Subunit: 231 residues, 2 copies
Amino acid sequence: SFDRPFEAARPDGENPSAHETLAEGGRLRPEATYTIPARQGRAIRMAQGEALMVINRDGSQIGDFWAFVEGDCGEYLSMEHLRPTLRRVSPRPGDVLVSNRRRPILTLLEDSSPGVHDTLVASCDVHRYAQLGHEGYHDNCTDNLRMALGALGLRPTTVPCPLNLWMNTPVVEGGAMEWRPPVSRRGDHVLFRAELDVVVVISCCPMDLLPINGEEAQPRALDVRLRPRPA
Amino acid sequence: SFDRPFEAARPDGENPSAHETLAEGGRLRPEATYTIPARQGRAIRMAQGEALMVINRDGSQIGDFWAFVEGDCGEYLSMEHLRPTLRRVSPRPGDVLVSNRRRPILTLLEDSSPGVHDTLVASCDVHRYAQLGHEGYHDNCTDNLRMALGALGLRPTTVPCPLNLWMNTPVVEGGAMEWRPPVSRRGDHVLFRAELDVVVVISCCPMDLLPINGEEAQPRALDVRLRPRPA
Ligand SMILES: [Cl-]
Ligand SMILES: [Cl-]
Ligand SMILES: [Cl-]
Ligand SMILES: [Zn+2]
Ligand SMILES: [Zn+2]
């Protein structure tokens, strides 16, 4: 039961994502690797023309992925706009990904995996875990988004649908959906080029009551590397 | 242009939706038939337990449909939460439709059509029409949402994905999406029961450059009728 209005920016609990940043201002160094720990989220600032590599180190982990325009969290990578622009349910290498203004925000340059991702499913939240029978607080992607932005002094005005990297949620004839383990492999990566200055947020999904992060249900970390704009 | 922040509440143009309401406060007289004009949007207040018929009078018209919690436009019927809750891409009669808090907001009670509706595609907007080659302002569902809420003194803080009633844009073999004419017929209706006090918004989609409102590409009106809460 709810006794207050919904607050997009307010976390329902805490983990180290509230206080720990990857680097000052989210500005990752060239030639460095960084890690989003298991069950946590982090924000990353990109300049136009830079490219971000996201690496599924252990091979079965989902990365809930968002991007916001620098200086405006009201404009963001938008799944419901991405789909009509591409005339496709999920992106492939070469696809330009748009914001809620239908302008380019990112390009998916590379994907070493079989290409299975999800754009249909909301980020997990305390309500999802309560409905799955969990008692007490559970780490969750929506809180990780809120905290990761907060750690850079930013405030979302809405929770967009994530791009669920490596998530395998097939829709079959009839419209039904299934929660299945991923088909990615150890070390698979995706590479995104920024088409605008952006703030990217990645949450290492902590879902451990369904097999979506692997049959073992043991959430793991993700590694990232930021490439500078080409010479 | 896009050197201003995106504003969820700000219409990009005007039509009579800015001004004209169905009834005072959007509070419909029970059992009276009202009409949302072609190309326009209107807001409708419903008390918990009341039900709303939406009638595709001419049979090929799409209705972009939203619902917000009364007193809190930050909580809304949410496509990306609807789908994991139902384990289905779109709803069918009997399905309880959830908000972005994963609690019931509406129940879909009846659908006389074959049950084809879209939950995947953003509401049309000025950017969509520009990209389809249109010159100047085109009526659009996003502006209709903004105006319809504004006409009641309300302001949205985000533009949720609509529930596109009667829209036939299936995901086909291999992941592509197709834009097809509706499979609804003259007089088809849906019936929703409010599970909370809500503000419903319906836009009669003005899309006339694709056959989604029928092969003739001639946008039409939609009728609505409220029934009172039961004993
Ligand atoms: Cl989930
Ligand atoms: Cl459209
Ligand atoms: Cl397939
Ligand atoms: Zn998650
Ligand atoms: Zn429309």
